[PDB]
PDB file of C-alpha atoms (C1' of nucleotides) in Angstrom:
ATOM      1  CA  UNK A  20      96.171  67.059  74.894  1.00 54.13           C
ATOM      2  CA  UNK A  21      97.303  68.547  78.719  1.00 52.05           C
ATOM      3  CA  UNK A  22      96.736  66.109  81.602  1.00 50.96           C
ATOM      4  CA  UNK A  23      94.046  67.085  83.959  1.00 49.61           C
ATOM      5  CA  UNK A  24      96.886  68.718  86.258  1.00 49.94           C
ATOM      6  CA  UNK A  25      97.920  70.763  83.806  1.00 47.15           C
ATOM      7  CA  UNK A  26      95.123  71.576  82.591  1.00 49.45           C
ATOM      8  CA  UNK A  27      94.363  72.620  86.118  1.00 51.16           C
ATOM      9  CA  UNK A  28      97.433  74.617  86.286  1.00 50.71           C
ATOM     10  CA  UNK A  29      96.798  76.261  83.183  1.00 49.24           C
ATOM     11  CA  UNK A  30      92.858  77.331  84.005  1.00 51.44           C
ATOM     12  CA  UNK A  31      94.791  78.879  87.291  1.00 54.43           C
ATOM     13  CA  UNK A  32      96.873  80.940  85.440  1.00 49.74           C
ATOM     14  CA  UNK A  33      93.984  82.359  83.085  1.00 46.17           C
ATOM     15  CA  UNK A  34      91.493  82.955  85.976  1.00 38.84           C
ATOM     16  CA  UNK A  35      94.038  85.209  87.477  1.00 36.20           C
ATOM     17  CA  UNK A  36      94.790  86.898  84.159  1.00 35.13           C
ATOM     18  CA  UNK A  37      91.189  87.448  83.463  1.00 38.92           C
ATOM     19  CA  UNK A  38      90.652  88.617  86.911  1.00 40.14           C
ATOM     20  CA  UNK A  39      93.868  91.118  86.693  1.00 40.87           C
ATOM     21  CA  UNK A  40      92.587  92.429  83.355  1.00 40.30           C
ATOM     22  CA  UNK A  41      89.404  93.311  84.788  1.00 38.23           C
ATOM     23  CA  UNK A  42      90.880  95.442  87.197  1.00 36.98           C
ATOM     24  CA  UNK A  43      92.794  96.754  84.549  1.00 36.24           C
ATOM     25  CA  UNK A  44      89.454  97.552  82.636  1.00 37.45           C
ATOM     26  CA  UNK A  45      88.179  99.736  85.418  1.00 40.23           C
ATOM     27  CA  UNK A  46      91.659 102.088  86.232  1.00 36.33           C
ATOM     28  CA  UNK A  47      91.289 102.469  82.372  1.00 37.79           C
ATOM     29  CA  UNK A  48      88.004 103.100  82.489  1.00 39.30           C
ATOM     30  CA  UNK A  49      88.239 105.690  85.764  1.00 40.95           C
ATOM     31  CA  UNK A  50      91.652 107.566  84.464  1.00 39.58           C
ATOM     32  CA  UNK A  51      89.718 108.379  81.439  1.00 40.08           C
ATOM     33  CA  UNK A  52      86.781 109.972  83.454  1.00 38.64           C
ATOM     34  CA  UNK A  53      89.344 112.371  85.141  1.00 39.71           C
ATOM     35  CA  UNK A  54      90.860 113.644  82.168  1.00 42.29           C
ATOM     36  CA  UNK A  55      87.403 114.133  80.485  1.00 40.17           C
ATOM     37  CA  UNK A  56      86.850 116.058  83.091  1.00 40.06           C
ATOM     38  CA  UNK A  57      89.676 118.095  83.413  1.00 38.41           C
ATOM     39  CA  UNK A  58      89.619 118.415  79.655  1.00 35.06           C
ATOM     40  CA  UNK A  59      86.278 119.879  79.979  1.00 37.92           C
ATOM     41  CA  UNK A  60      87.265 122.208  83.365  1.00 39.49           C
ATOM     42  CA  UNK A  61      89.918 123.712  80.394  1.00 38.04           C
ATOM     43  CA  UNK A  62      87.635 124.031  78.327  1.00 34.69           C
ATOM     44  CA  UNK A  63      84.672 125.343  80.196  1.00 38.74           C
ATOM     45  CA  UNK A  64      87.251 128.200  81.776  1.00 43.18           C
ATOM     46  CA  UNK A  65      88.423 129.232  78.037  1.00 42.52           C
ATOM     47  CA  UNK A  66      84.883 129.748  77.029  1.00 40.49           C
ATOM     48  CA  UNK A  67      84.689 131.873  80.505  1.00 39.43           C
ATOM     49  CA  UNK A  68      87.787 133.945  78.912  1.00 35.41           C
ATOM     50  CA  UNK A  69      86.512 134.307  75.821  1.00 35.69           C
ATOM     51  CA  UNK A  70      83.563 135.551  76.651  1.00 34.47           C
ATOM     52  CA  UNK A  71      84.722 138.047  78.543  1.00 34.31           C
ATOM     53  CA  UNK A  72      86.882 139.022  76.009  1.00 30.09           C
ATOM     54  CA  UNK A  73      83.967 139.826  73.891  1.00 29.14           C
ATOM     55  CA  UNK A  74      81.791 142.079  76.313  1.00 30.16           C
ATOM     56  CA  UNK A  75      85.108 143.852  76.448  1.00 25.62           C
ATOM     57  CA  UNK A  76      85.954 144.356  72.583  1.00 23.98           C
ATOM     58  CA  UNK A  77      82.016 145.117  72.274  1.00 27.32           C
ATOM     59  CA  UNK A  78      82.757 148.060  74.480  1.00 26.63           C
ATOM     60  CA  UNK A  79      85.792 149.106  72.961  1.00 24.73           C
ATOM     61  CA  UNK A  80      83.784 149.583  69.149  1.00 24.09           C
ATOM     62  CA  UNK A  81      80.788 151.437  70.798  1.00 23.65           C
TER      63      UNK A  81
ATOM     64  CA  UNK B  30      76.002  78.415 114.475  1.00 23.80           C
ATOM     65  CA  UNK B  31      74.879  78.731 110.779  1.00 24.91           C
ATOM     66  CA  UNK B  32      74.044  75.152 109.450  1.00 25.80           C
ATOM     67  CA  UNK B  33      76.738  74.713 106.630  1.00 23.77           C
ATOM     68  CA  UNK B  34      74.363  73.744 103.914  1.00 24.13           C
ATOM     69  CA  UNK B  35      72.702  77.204 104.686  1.00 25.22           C
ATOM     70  CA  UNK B  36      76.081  78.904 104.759  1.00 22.63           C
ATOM     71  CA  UNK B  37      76.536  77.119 101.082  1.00 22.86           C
ATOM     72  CA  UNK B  38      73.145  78.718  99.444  1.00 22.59           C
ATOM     73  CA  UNK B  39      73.945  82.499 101.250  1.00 25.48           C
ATOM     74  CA  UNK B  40      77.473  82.144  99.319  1.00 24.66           C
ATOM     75  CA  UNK B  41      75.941  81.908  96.455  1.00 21.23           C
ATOM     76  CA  UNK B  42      73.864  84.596  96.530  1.00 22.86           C
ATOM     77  CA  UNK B  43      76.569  86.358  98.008  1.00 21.91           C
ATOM     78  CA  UNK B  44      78.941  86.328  94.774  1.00 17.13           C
ATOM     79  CA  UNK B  45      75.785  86.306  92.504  1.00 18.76           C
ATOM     80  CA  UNK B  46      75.203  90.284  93.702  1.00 15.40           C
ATOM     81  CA  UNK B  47      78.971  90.651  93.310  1.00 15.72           C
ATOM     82  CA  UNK B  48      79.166  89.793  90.385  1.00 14.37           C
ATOM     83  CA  UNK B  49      76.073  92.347  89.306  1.00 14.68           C
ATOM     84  CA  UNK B  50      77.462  95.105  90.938  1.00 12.74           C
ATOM     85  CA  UNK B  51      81.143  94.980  88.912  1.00  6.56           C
ATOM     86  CA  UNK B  52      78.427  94.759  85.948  1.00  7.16           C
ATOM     87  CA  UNK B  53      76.616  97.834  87.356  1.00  7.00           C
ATOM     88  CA  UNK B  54      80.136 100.148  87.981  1.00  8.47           C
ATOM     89  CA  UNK B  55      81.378  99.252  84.448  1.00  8.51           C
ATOM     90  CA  UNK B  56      78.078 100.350  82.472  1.00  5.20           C
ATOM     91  CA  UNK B  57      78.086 103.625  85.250  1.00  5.57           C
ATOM     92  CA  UNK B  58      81.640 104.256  83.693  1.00  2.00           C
ATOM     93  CA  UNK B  59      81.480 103.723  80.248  1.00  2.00           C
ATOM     94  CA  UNK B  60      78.070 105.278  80.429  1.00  2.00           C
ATOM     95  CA  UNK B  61      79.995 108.727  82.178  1.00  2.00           C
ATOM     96  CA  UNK B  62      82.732 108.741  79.689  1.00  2.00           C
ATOM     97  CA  UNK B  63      80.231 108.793  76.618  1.00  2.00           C
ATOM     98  CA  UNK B  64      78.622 111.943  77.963  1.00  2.07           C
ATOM     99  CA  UNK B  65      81.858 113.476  78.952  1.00  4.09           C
ATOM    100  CA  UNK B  66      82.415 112.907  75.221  1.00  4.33           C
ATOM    101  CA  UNK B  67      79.489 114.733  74.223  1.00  4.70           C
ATOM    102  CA  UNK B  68      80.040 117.504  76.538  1.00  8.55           C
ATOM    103  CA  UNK B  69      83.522 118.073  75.079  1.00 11.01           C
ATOM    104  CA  UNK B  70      82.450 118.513  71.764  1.00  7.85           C
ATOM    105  CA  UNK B  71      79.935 121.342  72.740  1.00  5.66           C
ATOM    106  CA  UNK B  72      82.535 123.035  74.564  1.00  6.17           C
ATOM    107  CA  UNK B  73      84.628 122.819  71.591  1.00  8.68           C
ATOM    108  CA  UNK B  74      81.586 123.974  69.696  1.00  9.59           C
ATOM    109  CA  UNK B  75      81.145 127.146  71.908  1.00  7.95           C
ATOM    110  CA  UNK B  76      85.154 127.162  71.926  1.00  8.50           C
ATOM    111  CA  UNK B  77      85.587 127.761  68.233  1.00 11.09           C
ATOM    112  CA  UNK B  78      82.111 129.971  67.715  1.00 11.56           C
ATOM    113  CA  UNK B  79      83.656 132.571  70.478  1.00 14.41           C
ATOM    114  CA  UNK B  80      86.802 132.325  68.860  1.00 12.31           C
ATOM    115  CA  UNK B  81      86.071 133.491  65.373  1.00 15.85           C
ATOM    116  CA  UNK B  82      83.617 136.021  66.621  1.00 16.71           C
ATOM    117  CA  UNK B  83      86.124 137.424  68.779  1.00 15.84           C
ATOM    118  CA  UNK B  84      88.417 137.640  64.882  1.00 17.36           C
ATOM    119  CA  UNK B  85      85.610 138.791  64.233  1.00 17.88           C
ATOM    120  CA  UNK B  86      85.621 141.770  66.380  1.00 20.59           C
ATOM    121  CA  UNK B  87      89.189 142.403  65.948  1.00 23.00           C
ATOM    122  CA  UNK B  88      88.865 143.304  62.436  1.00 23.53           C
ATOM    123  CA  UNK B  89      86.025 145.995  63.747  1.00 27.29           C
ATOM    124  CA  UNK B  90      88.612 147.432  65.821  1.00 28.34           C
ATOM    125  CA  UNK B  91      90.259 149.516  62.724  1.00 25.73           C
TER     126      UNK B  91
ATOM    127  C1'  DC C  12      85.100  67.672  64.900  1.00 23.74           C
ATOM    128  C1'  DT C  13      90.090  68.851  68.175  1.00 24.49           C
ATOM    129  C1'  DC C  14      92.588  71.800  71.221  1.00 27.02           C
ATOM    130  C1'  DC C  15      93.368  75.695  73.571  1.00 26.67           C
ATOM    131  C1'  DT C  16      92.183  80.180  76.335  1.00 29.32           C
ATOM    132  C1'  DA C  17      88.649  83.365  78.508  1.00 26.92           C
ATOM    133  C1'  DT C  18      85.021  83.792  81.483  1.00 27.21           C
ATOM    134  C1'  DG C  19      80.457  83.020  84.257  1.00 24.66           C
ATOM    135  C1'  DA C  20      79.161  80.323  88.075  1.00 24.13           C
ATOM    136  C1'  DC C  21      80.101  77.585  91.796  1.00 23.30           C
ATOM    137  C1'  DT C  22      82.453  76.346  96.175  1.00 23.43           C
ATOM    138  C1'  DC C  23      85.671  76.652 100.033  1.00 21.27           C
ATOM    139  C1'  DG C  24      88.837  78.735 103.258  1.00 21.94           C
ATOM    140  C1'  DT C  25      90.104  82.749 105.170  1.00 20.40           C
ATOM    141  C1'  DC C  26      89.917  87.565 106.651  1.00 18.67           C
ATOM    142  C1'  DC C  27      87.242  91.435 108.773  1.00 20.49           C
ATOM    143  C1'  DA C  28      84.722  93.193 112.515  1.00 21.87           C
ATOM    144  C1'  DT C  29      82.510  93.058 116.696  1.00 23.47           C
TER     145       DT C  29
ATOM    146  C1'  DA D   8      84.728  84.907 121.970  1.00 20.83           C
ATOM    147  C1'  DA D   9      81.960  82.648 117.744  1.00 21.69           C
ATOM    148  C1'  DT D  10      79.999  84.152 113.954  1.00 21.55           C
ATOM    149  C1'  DG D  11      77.620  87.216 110.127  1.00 21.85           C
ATOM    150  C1'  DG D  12      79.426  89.201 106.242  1.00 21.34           C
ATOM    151  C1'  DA D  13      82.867  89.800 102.652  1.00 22.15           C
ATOM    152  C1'  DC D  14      85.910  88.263  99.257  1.00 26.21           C
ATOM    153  C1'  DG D  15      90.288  85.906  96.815  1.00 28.99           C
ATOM    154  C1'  DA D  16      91.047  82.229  94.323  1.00 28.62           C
ATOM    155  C1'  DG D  17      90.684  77.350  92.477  1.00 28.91           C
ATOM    156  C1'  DT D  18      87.742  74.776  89.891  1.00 31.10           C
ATOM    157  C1'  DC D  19      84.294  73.225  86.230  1.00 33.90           C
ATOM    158  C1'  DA D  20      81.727  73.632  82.068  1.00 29.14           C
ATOM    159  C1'  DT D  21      81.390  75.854  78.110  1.00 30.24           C
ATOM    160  C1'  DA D  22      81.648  79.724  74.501  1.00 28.87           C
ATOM    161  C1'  DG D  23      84.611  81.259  71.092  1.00 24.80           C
ATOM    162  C1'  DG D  24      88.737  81.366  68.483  1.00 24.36           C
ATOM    163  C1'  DA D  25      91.874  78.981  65.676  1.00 24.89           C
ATOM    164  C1'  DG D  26      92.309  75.515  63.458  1.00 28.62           C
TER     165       DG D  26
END
DNA sequence: CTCCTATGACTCGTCCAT
DNA sequence: AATGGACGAGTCATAGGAG
């Protein structure tokens, strides 16, 4: 098995991985909020078109 | 001067709260992307209900 | 059980802010 | 200032994975 320095050495290294793939974690995590959002401020503007498409053809057949 | 033995026990608490809080803004996220979630498929709901009653519509138009 | 990595908890030294 | 508050990072013990 590692010596204790190495072992040391080692732990170092995956403290500061874990830590960096926490950060990670969270721009994943935030950069999937935006587009949600903008996915939905499509979305939610379409529906807006649409619907004023409607009113529109309604008038057209009466 | 803070005695250093008190200095020791406020550290702890210290990166005990930290350590809660990254807890607290992960949940907050994950929490906001699973309702952004649901909130995209109702928009897509609404999308493809105006959609085929705007078809629908259309074919009225003869 | 061994042997390794990942991670919560702890401490220390250092930076920030005044 | 000297010092309260904040926080990066090294360390330890241990869970969990792979034997």
């Amino acid at each position: 098995h590692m010596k204790a320095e190495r072992k040391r050495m080692r732990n170092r290294i995956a403290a500061s991985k874990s830590r960096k793939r926490k950060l990670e974690r969270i721009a994943r995590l935030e950069e999937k909020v935006k587009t949600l959002k903008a996915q939905n401020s499509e979305l939610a503007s379409t529906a807006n078109m649409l619907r004023e498409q409607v009113a529109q053809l309604k008038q057209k057949v009466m």
